Design a protein around this ligand. Structure first.
Ligand SMILES: O=C(N[C@H](CO)[C@H](O)c1ccc([N+](=O)[O-])cc1)C(Cl)Cl
Ligand SMILES: [Mg+2]
Ligand SMILES: [Mg+2]
Ligand SMILES: [Mg+2]
Ligand SMILES: [Mg+2]
Ligand SMILES: [Mg+2]
Ligand SMILES: [Mg+2]
Ligand SMILES: [Mg+2]
Ligand SMILES: [Mg+2]
Ligand SMILES: [Mg+2]
Ligand SMILES: [Mg+2]
Ligand SMILES: [Mg+2]
Ligand SMILES: [Mg+2]
Ligand SMILES: [Mg+2]
Ligand SMILES: [Mg+2]
Ligand SMILES: [Mg+2]
Ligand SMILES: [Mg+2]
Ligand SMILES: [Mg+2]
Ligand SMILES: [Mg+2]
Ligand SMILES: [Mg+2]
Ligand SMILES: [Mg+2]
Ligand SMILES: [Mg+2]
Ligand SMILES: [Mg+2]
Ligand SMILES: [Mg+2]
Ligand SMILES: [Mg+2]
Ligand SMILES: [Mg+2]
Ligand SMILES: [Mg+2]
Ligand SMILES: [Mg+2]
Ligand SMILES: [Mg+2]
Ligand SMILES: [Mg+2]
Ligand SMILES: [Mg+2]
Ligand SMILES: [Mg+2]
Ligand SMILES: [Mg+2]
Ligand SMILES: [Mg+2]
Ligand SMILES: [Mg+2]
Ligand SMILES: [Mg+2]
Ligand SMILES: [Mg+2]
Ligand SMILES: [Mg+2]
Ligand SMILES: [Mg+2]
Ligand SMILES: [Mg+2]
Ligand SMILES: [Mg+2]
Ligand SMILES: [Mg+2]
Ligand SMILES: [Mg+2]
Ligand SMILES: [Mg+2]
Ligand SMILES: [Mg+2]
Ligand SMILES: [Mg+2]
Ligand SMILES: [Mg+2]
Ligand SMILES: [Mg+2]
Ligand SMILES: [Mg+2]
Ligand SMILES: [Mg+2]
Ligand SMILES: [Mg+2]
Ligand SMILES: [Mg+2]
Ligand SMILES: [Mg+2]
Ligand SMILES: [Mg+2]
Ligand SMILES: [Mg+2]
Ligand SMILES: [Mg+2]
Ligand SMILES: [Mg+2]
Ligand SMILES: [Mg+2]
Ligand SMILES: [Mg+2]
Ligand SMILES: [Mg+2]
Ligand SMILES: [Mg+2]
Ligand SMILES: [Mg+2]
Ligand SMILES: [Mg+2]
Ligand SMILES: [Mg+2]
Ligand SMILES: [Mg+2]
Ligand SMILES: [Mg+2]
Ligand SMILES: [Mg+2]
Ligand SMILES: [Mg+2]
Ligand SMILES: [Mg+2]
Ligand SMILES: [Mg+2]
Ligand SMILES: [Mg+2]
Ligand SMILES: [Mg+2]
Ligand SMILES: [Mg+2]
Ligand SMILES: [Mg+2]
Ligand SMILES: [Mg+2]
Ligand SMILES: [Mg+2]
Ligand SMILES: [Mg+2]
Ligand SMILES: [Mg+2]
Ligand SMILES: [Mg+2]
Ligand SMILES: [Mg+2]
Ligand SMILES: [Mg+2]
Ligand SMILES: [Mg+2]
Ligand SMILES: [Mg+2]
Ligand SMILES: [Mg+2]
Ligand SMILES: [Mg+2]
Ligand SMILES: [Mg+2]
Ligand SMILES: [Mg+2]
Ligand SMILES: [Mg+2]
Ligand SMILES: [Mg+2]
Ligand SMILES: [Mg+2]
Ligand SMILES: [Mg+2]
Ligand SMILES: [Mg+2]
Ligand SMILES: [Mg+2]
Ligand SMILES: [Mg+2]
Ligand SMILES: [Mg+2]
Ligand SMILES: [Mg+2]
Ligand SMILES: [Mg+2]
Ligand SMILES: [Mg+2]
Ligand SMILES: [Mg+2]
Ligand SMILES: [Mg+2]
Ligand SMILES: [Mg+2]
Ligand SMILES: [Mg+2]
Ligand SMILES: [Mg+2]
Ligand SMILES: [Mg+2]
Ligand SMILES: [Mg+2]
Ligand SMILES: [Mg+2]
Ligand SMILES: [Mg+2]
Ligand SMILES: [Mg+2]
Ligand SMILES: [Mg+2]
Ligand SMILES: [Mg+2]
Ligand SMILES: [Mg+2]
Ligand SMILES: [Mg+2]
Ligand SMILES: [Mg+2]
Ligand SMILES: [Mg+2]
Ligand SMILES: [Mg+2]
Ligand SMILES: [Mg+2]
Ligand SMILES: [Mg+2]
Ligand SMILES: [Mg+2]
Ligand SMILES: [Mg+2]
Ligand SMILES: [Mg+2]
Ligand SMILES: [Mg+2]
Ligand SMILES: [Mg+2]
Ligand SMILES: [Mg+2]
Ligand SMILES: [Mg+2]
Ligand SMILES: [Mg+2]
Ligand SMILES: [Mg+2]
Ligand SMILES: [Mg+2]
Ligand SMILES: [Mg+2]
Ligand SMILES: [Mg+2]
Ligand SMILES: [Mg+2]
Ligand SMILES: [Mg+2]
Ligand SMILES: [Mg+2]
Ligand SMILES: [Mg+2]
Ligand SMILES: [Mg+2]
Ligand SMILES: [Mg+2]
Ligand SMILES: [Mg+2]
Ligand SMILES: [Mg+2]
Ligand SMILES: [Mg+2]
Ligand SMILES: [Mg+2]
Ligand SMILES: [Mg+2]
Ligand SMILES: [Mg+2]
Ligand SMILES: [Mg+2]
Ligand SMILES: [Mg+2]
Ligand SMILES: [Mg+2]
Ligand SMILES: [Mg+2]
Ligand SMILES: [Mg+2]
Ligand SMILES: [Mg+2]
Ligand SMILES: [Mg+2]
Ligand SMILES: [Mg+2]
Ligand SMILES: [Mg+2]
Ligand SMILES: [Mg+2]
Ligand SMILES: [Mg+2]
Ligand SMILES: [Mg+2]
Ligand SMILES: [Mg+2]
Ligand SMILES: [Mg+2]
Ligand SMILES: [Mg+2]
Ligand SMILES: [Mg+2]
Ligand SMILES: [Mg+2]
Ligand SMILES: [Mg+2]
Ligand SMILES: [Mg+2]
Ligand SMILES: [Mg+2]
Ligand SMILES: [Mg+2]
Ligand SMILES: [Mg+2]
Ligand SMILES: [Mg+2]
Ligand SMILES: [Mg+2]
Ligand SMILES: [Mg+2]
Ligand SMILES: [Mg+2]
Ligand SMILES: [Mg+2]
Ligand SMILES: [Mg+2]
Ligand SMILES: [Mg+2]
Ligand SMILES: [Mg+2]
Ligand SMILES: [Mg+2]
Ligand SMILES: [Mg+2]
Ligand SMILES: [Mg+2]
Ligand SMILES: [Mg+2]
Ligand SMILES: [Mg+2]
Ligand SMILES: [Mg+2]
Ligand SMILES: [Mg+2]
Ligand SMILES: [Mg+2]
Ligand SMILES: [Mg+2]
Ligand SMILES: [Mg+2]
Ligand SMILES: [Mg+2]
Ligand SMILES: [Mg+2]
Ligand SMILES: [Mg+2]
Ligand SMILES: [Mg+2]
Ligand SMILES: [Mg+2]
Ligand SMILES: [Mg+2]
Ligand SMILES: [Mg+2]
Ligand SMILES: [Mg+2]
Ligand SMILES: [Mg+2]
Ligand SMILES: [Mg+2]
Ligand SMILES: [Mg+2]
Ligand SMILES: [Mg+2]
Ligand SMILES: [Mg+2]
Ligand SMILES: [Mg+2]
Ligand SMILES: [Mg+2]
Ligand SMILES: [Mg+2]
Ligand SMILES: [Mg+2]
Ligand SMILES: [Mg+2]
Ligand SMILES: [Mg+2]
Ligand SMILES: [Mg+2]
Ligand SMILES: [Mg+2]
Ligand SMILES: [Mg+2]
Ligand SMILES: [Mg+2]
Ligand SMILES: [Mg+2]
Ligand SMILES: [Mg+2]
Ligand SMILES: [Mg+2]
Ligand SMILES: [Mg+2]
Ligand SMILES: [Mg+2]
Ligand SMILES: [Mg+2]
Ligand SMILES: [Mg+2]
Ligand SMILES: [Mg+2]
Ligand SMILES: [Mg+2]
Ligand SMILES: [Mg+2]
Ligand SMILES: [Mg+2]
Ligand SMILES: [Mg+2]
Ligand SMILES: [Mg+2]
Ligand SMILES: [Mg+2]
Ligand SMILES: [Mg+2]
Ligand SMILES: [Mg+2]
Ligand SMILES: [Mg+2]
Ligand SMILES: [Mg+2]
Ligand SMILES: [Mg+2]
Ligand SMILES: [Mg+2]
Ligand SMILES: [Mg+2]
Ligand SMILES: [Mg+2]
Ligand SMILES: [Mg+2]
Ligand SMILES: [Mg+2]
Ligand SMILES: [Mg+2]
Ligand SMILES: [Mg+2]
Ligand SMILES: [Mg+2]
Ligand SMILES: [Mg+2]
Ligand SMILES: [Mg+2]
Ligand SMILES: [Mg+2]
Ligand SMILES: [Mg+2]
Ligand SMILES: [Mg+2]
Ligand SMILES: [Mg+2]
Ligand SMILES: [Mg+2]
Ligand SMILES: [Mg+2]
Ligand SMILES: [Mg+2]
Ligand SMILES: [Mg+2]
Ligand SMILES: [Mg+2]
Ligand SMILES: [Mg+2]
Ligand SMILES: [Mg+2]
Ligand SMILES: [Mg+2]
Ligand SMILES: [Mg+2]
Ligand SMILES: [Mg+2]
Ligand SMILES: [Mg+2]
Ligand SMILES: [Mg+2]
Ligand SMILES: [Mg+2]
Ligand SMILES: [Mg+2]
Ligand SMILES: [Mg+2]
Ligand SMILES: [Mg+2]
Ligand SMILES: [Mg+2]
Ligand SMILES: [Mg+2]
Ligand SMILES: [Mg+2]
Ligand SMILES: [Mg+2]
Ligand SMILES: [Mg+2]
Lengths: 48, 275
RNA sequence: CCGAGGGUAGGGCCCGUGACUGGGGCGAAGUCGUAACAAGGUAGCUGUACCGGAAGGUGCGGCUGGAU
RNA sequence: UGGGAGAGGGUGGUGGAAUUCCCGGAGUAGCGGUGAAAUGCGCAGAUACCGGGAGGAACGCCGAUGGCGAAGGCAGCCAC
RNA sequence: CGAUGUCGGCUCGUCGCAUCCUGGGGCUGAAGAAGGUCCCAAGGGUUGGGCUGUUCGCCCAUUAAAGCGGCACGCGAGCUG
RNA sequence: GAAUGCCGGCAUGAGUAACGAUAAAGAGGGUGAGAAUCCCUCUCGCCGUAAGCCCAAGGGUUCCUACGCAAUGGUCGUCAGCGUAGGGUUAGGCGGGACCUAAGGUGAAGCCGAAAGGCGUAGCCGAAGGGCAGCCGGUUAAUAUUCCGGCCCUUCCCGCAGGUGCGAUGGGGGGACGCUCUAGGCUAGGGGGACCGGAGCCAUGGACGAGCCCGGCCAGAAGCGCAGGGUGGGAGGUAGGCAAAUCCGCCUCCCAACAAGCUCUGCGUGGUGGGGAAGCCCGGGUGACAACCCCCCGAAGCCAGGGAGCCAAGAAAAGCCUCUAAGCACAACCUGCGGGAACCCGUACCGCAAACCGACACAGGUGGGCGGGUGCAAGAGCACUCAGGCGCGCGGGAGAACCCUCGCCAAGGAACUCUGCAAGUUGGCCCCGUAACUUCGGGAGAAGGGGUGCUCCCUGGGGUGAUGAGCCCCGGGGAGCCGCAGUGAACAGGCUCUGGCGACUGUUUACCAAAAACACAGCUCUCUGCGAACUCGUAAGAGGAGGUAUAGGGAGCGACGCUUGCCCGGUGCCGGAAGGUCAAGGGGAGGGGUGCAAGCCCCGAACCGAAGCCCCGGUGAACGGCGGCCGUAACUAUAACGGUCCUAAGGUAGCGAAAUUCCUUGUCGGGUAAGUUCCGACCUGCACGAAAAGCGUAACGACCGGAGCGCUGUCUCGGCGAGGGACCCGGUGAAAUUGAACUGGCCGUGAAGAUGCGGCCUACCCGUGGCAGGACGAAAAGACCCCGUGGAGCUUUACUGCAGCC
RNA sequence: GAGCUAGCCCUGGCCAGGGUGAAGCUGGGGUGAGACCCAGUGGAGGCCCGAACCGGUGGGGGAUGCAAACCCCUCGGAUGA
RNA sequence: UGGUUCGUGGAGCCAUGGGGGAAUCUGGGCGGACCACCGCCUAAGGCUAAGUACUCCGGGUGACCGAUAGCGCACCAGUAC
């Protein structure tokens, strides 16, 4: 049957992407948090 | 004169449709239409704030002239009578000798080819607009401004009208379509006659799909729901209300008055509606 | 080939019969009330409508085959 | 051909009397109703009286023992 | 109660005997034929339907007879539901 | 040493289950250390509205070539979507951007919010919508509308020439639109040819034939032809299109009008450029100077912004054209021609799947286009086949039980069972024919029947063409032939009678319920006069609605028919300027503290003083409710009638052992040989009853009862047969579970159901196929039940607050 | 977190073939004029049969599955909510 | 209403959302309702080192760990997944 992951590059970029995150107070806490944890990627990669 | 169908489907047995007799022109004036943004009952938060709305036929909004004291003294010719899907009344296309083109609500008896006019000195004739103070007492009127220069607010639905009952100072007394007696300021405009398309009340939708065409999604009874949803929800089996009948939000809905107490327009309503 | 008739399926008319049910007629001395005949004690009767244990009552309109 | 009488019919106007309700006034101890009463209405101001307003229905006198219509039936006044 | 699946049916049996039939008896208010009642006897047998989820029961047509109980009201790591 | 402990390692189950669609394989020849599994050839089989082809998304080198086989591959492996390395994606015209706007998002102005932030007009962003210039062929191992070849075209810059009042983010036109049905003419695509081209073929009885087999086109600029879309001309006035306007709009007059004229597409032709089969011989060459023609069928595509009808009344903005304003008329614009200039990103490959979403090379899921032929009435259905693509990444044997899927069956024919569950039956088309009832539509495919192939002969009408021939499409009559059987295979209703419920088509518990539930047109009540009520929000602001009582919110009922009774004492809601109660506040009789005192300070009665509540009324399609005991008729029985107690009032019509009836399988009738169900009645209705509607109701229903006919392996009652497993051999090889085990029966005993204790009996050691009675077998720290001063959803006239409203 | 799912918003797309035969229109009849009847034409509908497509009724299989909802047969809708 | 030990308490003090609303030393606040007396202080403007806190970083030292320990990471870890 139809499953729950239906990849969509525009959707991924507009929902979790860098500029989505920076626009909002909670989004910027995500970036600050993931920088402090030292993540190699701050945001999900999508080929655009 | 509503039109009936033979019972060649279960639904055609009851369906009735308007005759569209008075209509003389079947596509709208291109410079008088603009797109009508269907809301679906959602506000600027995106929240449903009016239940059971959406999914009706696409429509274009026709611009209607609800002032008419715009063009005092400038006669106009009734060029056509057309269908308007944004309102129950039909609408009339006016060709002003000015060259300007406008739309009005189509009163009863207005014939294509006649001339109408607006102003203090207009003939008391069907389709003419005047300040209320210059219309003789007892004249059936429609498209009535509520406050001077603010725009026709009263009696716009198919078949409705207000009747001029008397004068008092700067004010006239109107019996509204509801039967309320209200004072309206004498400088407010109105149009002689009643709105047309009076048979509109006897249309039988006939089937569920017809409600859907109009943008009306199905209404769900509170007694069909669960207590999380509604005062009338729950119960083993069917159940009576078991409490004073209530809206989804808990307020009572069989007689509980709801006009705000200290409203300033109370000084201007004489008698509440009846019946 | 037609063909008595047999078989199959579906209709029409008539007759008898049926738990139960509807009123009808009849039946020396049952129970309830008193609607009508006198102005019958609310003049009567009438078409219809609604109501009532029952006759009846009431409404609307009609008739005199109503009295004083 | 030329005349006449008539609530004959249909449509739309429109006039006064009365009843009811609403507003204002003035006034107070009852009103209404019956065979007699009671229910009811009334000091939260009724009834009775005065001005104003809204609305529906029916057309007093003329009127008759009258007139018209095939019958059922048709009565303020005006026009078609 | 860190689980012993719970009615009826179907399938498959097996056992008890307080015996429904068949076998052997005594008594009889046992003429015969047919029964009644008690004793011995568990080898074998003990039917097909209508109704109801039914167990049970009633009914139909038969039969030598159409037995009554136990086996976790036998049997769901065998089926049904 | 235990915590169903934690982490890791390793056992058991076990050489067991399995190895992922039952579309299927056999042989020969290669290669190699090694071959059922790689490559080649022949034979066989499977898909063919796909299991073929082309786009989009997603994936991200998986593409091509060389060299490899440890691991990945459910076996093998020399092969590979695997390892290593090298190579491969070429654009002014295809798609996106340097263009436009949609919802939406963002947001100078402005508004709001403790902070964070929330709104918001224009504007800006935003596409698979609008707009915009490229087609055919060749080439690579791998890209091609991109490279090359042929023929075309767009924009920008500059210049030449001719022309004109040139000029815009501004005005206006246009862009610009639905659903169904549909005309004419074409194109795509297809069928046929006794015509044109072609390597060949004559078999096994016959055929050297008007034989068989193969093929018979594609693109094209101007011009021309066919068919279509679009579009009036001129003059005068002008106050409207937020300045101006010669434009548009309005009015008047003349002319033209199913045309033509101009314009714009489609198709045809077209200079020219391409392609070109079988077969044969090694992707190539030949064939070949290949031929390239006629007839028919014919779109849902094209002309297109075509036509008609209908109601539910069907985006925007730019490109483009016209108008003028600043301005400027050495300019600028328009037209024709010439030279120059023309950027960024994508392009490989998979793409109904082994490369995407499902942990897997997973029988599942994934949007658009193309989808040939013949026959079956049609069709994208069904069977078989073309092109093309596959045989599904373990095999070889055997021919037990049992399981799955499938075929048949003597006599009977529902006797099976909760139930005809399941499976039979019926089954397409044409013709005949068809009941109660009904809302006149239907019920209806009712039911029930007959016909169905092939040959010959005679004949009617249509389409193309020409009116004819030919090809193609509908038919009519007559005579014959064969079989068990002619929709000869595949696809393709069993029917009827009668109740319950719901009017109907719809909707729902993704993944145990599809229904009688929800919705539904329709009916009633109620709120709302517009800055509406109501809803979301602290607010601003939105929705309601650019609507206005024939409208919008809320509630119940639920097509339609005939109806919907009595109770307002309690609760609700509505009305009531009296009265009663009533908070802050006002008032200040009268008290008190302190000070020598002027004073400062505290308590404070009457009286005034909202909503609410009390009180007086109304109100049921508001919440709701609608009695008991006793007596009575000239047979009996039963009470039309009466007495009395109580109530706010004592259930009307209609229906009733019912989706409701406890006693109950009530009683009587029907149907049956027999009927706890069914149907029809009765009425002592435990405990129907009128919009939580009452009683009916044609049509409808994968709803739930009862019956009959048809037919059956459901059954008496089983038998046989097929294939996939099970079994055996070679390859690969799990699992839950598991205190350890050297793990028998009886009768007892034991914490009360013992392989493990007692006594007796029985029993050589170890396996393999089977069956499920036990190991209180496995699974899941019982869901039921209780307990915990455990939790959570829900309710209200429980308590106590809060929003909201007064 | 609405790339699953529910509703709405904007913009596109899809629904083989066959059957039934409403209104209207025309001609005819009818009448004072009408209503209305008959024939043809027409092509309506939460109309009918049935693929695609969307579903998920009954049964069987599957149950350490091909699959954490699948497979076979059968069945509902298929111009419309 | 908050703050303080102060939860309305005899409830002052400090702060302030609402209403009313002064004076300039003979002015004004405080000493726990209030009054007197005795005293303390000078609101409605602003700044101001040091002593105090913390440990991303550097170093020194452990009756601190020694690869299941010590940081999640001794190792290409905020990685693979
Ligand atoms: O609850 C069950 N069984 C338990 C065993 O743990 C027990 O046997 C039981 C069975 C039936 C029962 N009953 O019928 O009331 C009660 C307990 C099973 Cl139904 Cl799961
Ligand atoms: Mg899904
Ligand atoms: Mg998606
Ligand atoms: Mg994307
Ligand atoms: Mg996208
Ligand atoms: Mg997206
Ligand atoms: Mg977002
Ligand atoms: Mg983003
Ligand atoms: Mg912040
Ligand atoms: Mg890095
Ligand atoms: Mg992130
Ligand atoms: Mg109708
Ligand atoms: Mg009809
Ligand atoms: Mg009209
Ligand atoms: Mg526009
Ligand atoms: Mg809006
Ligand atoms: Mg918004
Ligand atoms: Mg938002
Ligand atoms: Mg609402
Ligand atoms: Mg809504
Ligand atoms: Mg409206
Ligand atoms: Mg209208
Ligand atoms: Mg006014
Ligand atoms: Mg209505
Ligand atoms: Mg609509
Ligand atoms: Mg509605
Ligand atoms: Mg509803
Ligand atoms: Mg409910
Ligand atoms: Mg519910
Ligand atoms: Mg909720
Ligand atoms: Mg709640
Ligand atoms: Mg609630
Ligand atoms: Mg309730
Ligand atoms: Mg309920
Ligand atoms: Mg319920
Ligand atoms: Mg109940
Ligand atoms: Mg009920
Ligand atoms: Mg209740
Ligand atoms: Mg309530
Ligand atoms: Mg409210
Ligand atoms: Mg009112
Ligand atoms: Mg004979
Ligand atoms: Mg007597
Ligand atoms: Mg009498
Ligand atoms: Mg009498
Ligand atoms: Mg009397
Ligand atoms: Mg009398
Ligand atoms: Mg009476
Ligand atoms: Mg009094
Ligand atoms: Mg008084
Ligand atoms: Mg009135
Ligand atoms: Mg237990
Ligand atoms: Mg356990
Ligand atoms: Mg267990
Ligand atoms: Mg004897
Ligand atoms: Mg025996
Ligand atoms: Mg039992
Ligand atoms: Mg019994
Ligand atoms: Mg015997
Ligand atoms: Mg027994
Ligand atoms: Mg027992
Ligand atoms: Mg028992
Ligand atoms: Mg058992
Ligand atoms: Mg079981
Ligand atoms: Mg059982
Ligand atoms: Mg078991
Ligand atoms: Mg067991
Ligand atoms: Mg221990
Ligand atoms: Mg464990
Ligand atoms: Mg543990
Ligand atoms: Mg342990
Ligand atoms: Mg562990
Ligand atoms: Mg381990
Ligand atoms: Mg290790
Ligand atoms: Mg191991
Ligand atoms: Mg082992
Ligand atoms: Mg084993
Ligand atoms: Mg296994
Ligand atoms: Mg498997
Ligand atoms: Mg298969
Ligand atoms: Mg072979
Ligand atoms: Mg082979
Ligand atoms: Mg091999
Ligand atoms: Mg090998
Ligand atoms: Mg090969
Ligand atoms: Mg095919
Ligand atoms: Mg991937
Ligand atoms: Mg390998
Ligand atoms: Mg290997
Ligand atoms: Mg491997
Ligand atoms: Mg595998
Ligand atoms: Mg090798
Ligand atoms: Mg490549
Ligand atoms: Mg190019
Ligand atoms: Mg540029
Ligand atoms: Mg901000
Ligand atoms: Mg954007
Ligand atoms: Mg853009
Ligand atoms: Mg675009
Ligand atoms: Mg382009
Ligand atoms: Mg081209
Ligand atoms: Mg090409
Ligand atoms: Mg090369
Ligand atoms: Mg347009
Ligand atoms: Mg438009
Ligand atoms: Mg469009
Ligand atoms: Mg439509
Ligand atoms: Mg072509
Ligand atoms: Mg063809
Ligand atoms: Mg002008
Ligand atoms: Mg075009
Ligand atoms: Mg050559
Ligand atoms: Mg199409
Ligand atoms: Mg088109
Ligand atoms: Mg716009
Ligand atoms: Mg100038
Ligand atoms: Mg110059
Ligand atoms: Mg020009
Ligand atoms: Mg650039
Ligand atoms: Mg490419
Ligand atoms: Mg597929
Ligand atoms: Mg593949
Ligand atoms: Mg997942
Ligand atoms: Mg595979
Ligand atoms: Mg072909
Ligand atoms: Mg066919
Ligand atoms: Mg295979
Ligand atoms: Mg397959
Ligand atoms: Mg074997
Ligand atoms: Mg199979
Ligand atoms: Mg067969
Ligand atoms: Mg045979
Ligand atoms: Mg048989
Ligand atoms: Mg039979
Ligand atoms: Mg038979
Ligand atoms: Mg049976
Ligand atoms: Mg049986
Ligand atoms: Mg059942
Ligand atoms: Mg049945
Ligand atoms: Mg068939
Ligand atoms: Mg019949
Ligand atoms: Mg019939
Ligand atoms: Mg019938
Ligand atoms: Mg019937
Ligand atoms: Mg009929
Ligand atoms: Mg038939
Ligand atoms: Mg024949
Ligand atoms: Mg033949
Ligand atoms: Mg023969
Ligand atoms: Mg069928
Ligand atoms: Mg239904
Ligand atoms: Mg239902
Ligand atoms: Mg019903
Ligand atoms: Mg009904
Ligand atoms: Mg449907
Ligand atoms: Mg479910
Ligand atoms: Mg569920
Ligand atoms: Mg679930
Ligand atoms: Mg199910
Ligand atoms: Mg259910
Ligand atoms: Mg259903
Ligand atoms: Mg539901
Ligand atoms: Mg319904
Ligand atoms: Mg109503
Ligand atoms: Mg709110
Ligand atoms: Mg609020
Ligand atoms: Mg609006
Ligand atoms: Mg209904
Ligand atoms: Mg109804
Ligand atoms: Mg409903
Ligand atoms: Mg209901
Ligand atoms: Mg009451
Ligand atoms: Mg009351
Ligand atoms: Mg009350
Ligand atoms: Mg009560
Ligand atoms: Mg009644
Ligand atoms: Mg009964
Ligand atoms: Mg009943
Ligand atoms: Mg009951
Ligand atoms: Mg019973
Ligand atoms: Mg019972
Ligand atoms: Mg019985
Ligand atoms: Mg009987
Ligand atoms: Mg009885
Ligand atoms: Mg109720
Ligand atoms: Mg009827
Ligand atoms: Mg019916
Ligand atoms: Mg249904
Ligand atoms: Mg159903
Ligand atoms: Mg039968
Ligand atoms: Mg069998
Ligand atoms: Mg076999
Ligand atoms: Mg091996
Ligand atoms: Mg292996
Ligand atoms: Mg041991
Ligand atoms: Mg041992
Ligand atoms: Mg052992
Ligand atoms: Mg042993
Ligand atoms: Mg014991
Ligand atoms: Mg024992
Ligand atoms: Mg032992
Ligand atoms: Mg021992
Ligand atoms: Mg011992
Ligand atoms: Mg022992
Ligand atoms: Mg022993
Ligand atoms: Mg023994
Ligand atoms: Mg073995
Ligand atoms: Mg074994
Ligand atoms: Mg066992
Ligand atoms: Mg067992
Ligand atoms: Mg066991
Ligand atoms: Mg145990
Ligand atoms: Mg056990
Ligand atoms: Mg479990
Ligand atoms: Mg636990
Ligand atoms: Mg427990
Ligand atoms: Mg548990
Ligand atoms: Mg317990
Ligand atoms: Mg407690
Ligand atoms: Mg306790
Ligand atoms: Mg608790
Ligand atoms: Mg709680
Ligand atoms: Mg609060
Ligand atoms: Mg989604
Ligand atoms: Mg369709
Ligand atoms: Mg037909
Ligand atoms: Mg026809
Ligand atoms: Mg027509
Ligand atoms: Mg349909
Ligand atoms: Mg049909
Ligand atoms: Mg589904
Ligand atoms: Mg299924
Ligand atoms: Mg079945
Ligand atoms: Mg499962
Ligand atoms: Mg399936
Ligand atoms: Mg199937
Ligand atoms: Mg079907
Ligand atoms: Mg269908
Ligand atoms: Mg269809
Ligand atoms: Mg404090
Ligand atoms: Mg204090
Ligand atoms: Mg303050
Ligand atoms: Mg001074
Ligand atoms: Mg001082
Ligand atoms: Mg002082
Ligand atoms: Mg102070
Ligand atoms: Mg102090
Ligand atoms: Mg001090
Ligand atoms: Mg100072
Ligand atoms: Mg100081
Ligand atoms: Mg400091
Ligand atoms: Mg250090
Ligand atoms: Mg280590
Ligand atoms: Mg470590
Ligand atoms: Mg350690
Ligand atoms: Mg570190
Ligand atoms: Mg670690
Ligand atoms: Mg790493």
């Amino acid at each position: 049957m139809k499953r729950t992951w239906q990849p969509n590059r525009r959707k991924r970029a507009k929902t979790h992407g860098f500029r989505a995150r920076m626009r909002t107070p909670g989004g910027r806490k995500v970036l600050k948090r993931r920088r402090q944890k030292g993540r190699w990627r701050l945001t999900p990669a999508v080929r655009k | 004169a509503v039109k009936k169908f033979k019972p060649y489907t279960p639904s055609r047995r009851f369906m009735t449709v308007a005759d569209f007799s008075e209509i003389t022109k079947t596509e709208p004036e291109k410079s008088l239409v603009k797109p009508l943004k269907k809301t679906g009952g959602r506000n600027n938060q995106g929240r449903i704030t009016v239940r059971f709305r959406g999914g009706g036929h696409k429509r274009l909004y026709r611009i209607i002239d609800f002032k008419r004291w715009d063009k005092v003294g400038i006669p106009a010719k009734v060029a056509a009578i057309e269908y308007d899907p944004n309102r129950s009344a039909r609408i009339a296309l006016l060709h002003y000798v000015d060259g300007e083109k406008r739309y009005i609500i189509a009163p009863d008896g207005l014939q294509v080819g006649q001339q109408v006019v607006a102003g203090p000195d207009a003939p008391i004739q069907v389709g003419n607009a005047l300040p209320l103070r210059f219309i003789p007492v007892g004249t059936v009127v429609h498209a009535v401004e509520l406050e001077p220069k603010k725009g026709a607010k009263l009696a716009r639905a198919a078949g409705t009208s207000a009747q001029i009952q008397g004068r008092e100072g700067d004010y006239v007394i109107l019996r509204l379509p509801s039967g309320e007696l209200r004072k309206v300021h004498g400088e407010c405009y109105a149009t002689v006659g009643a709105v047309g398309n009076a048979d509109h009340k006897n249309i039988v939708l006939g089937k569920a799909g017809r409600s859907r065409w109009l943008g009306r999604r199905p209404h769900v009874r509170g007694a069909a729901m669960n207590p999380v949803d509604h005062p009338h929800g729950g119960g083993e089996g069917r159940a009576p209300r078991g409490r004073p009948p209530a809206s989804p939000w808990g307020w009572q809905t069989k007689g509980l008055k709801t006009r705000k107490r200290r409203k300033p327009s109370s000084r201007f309503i004489i008698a509440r509606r009846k019946k």
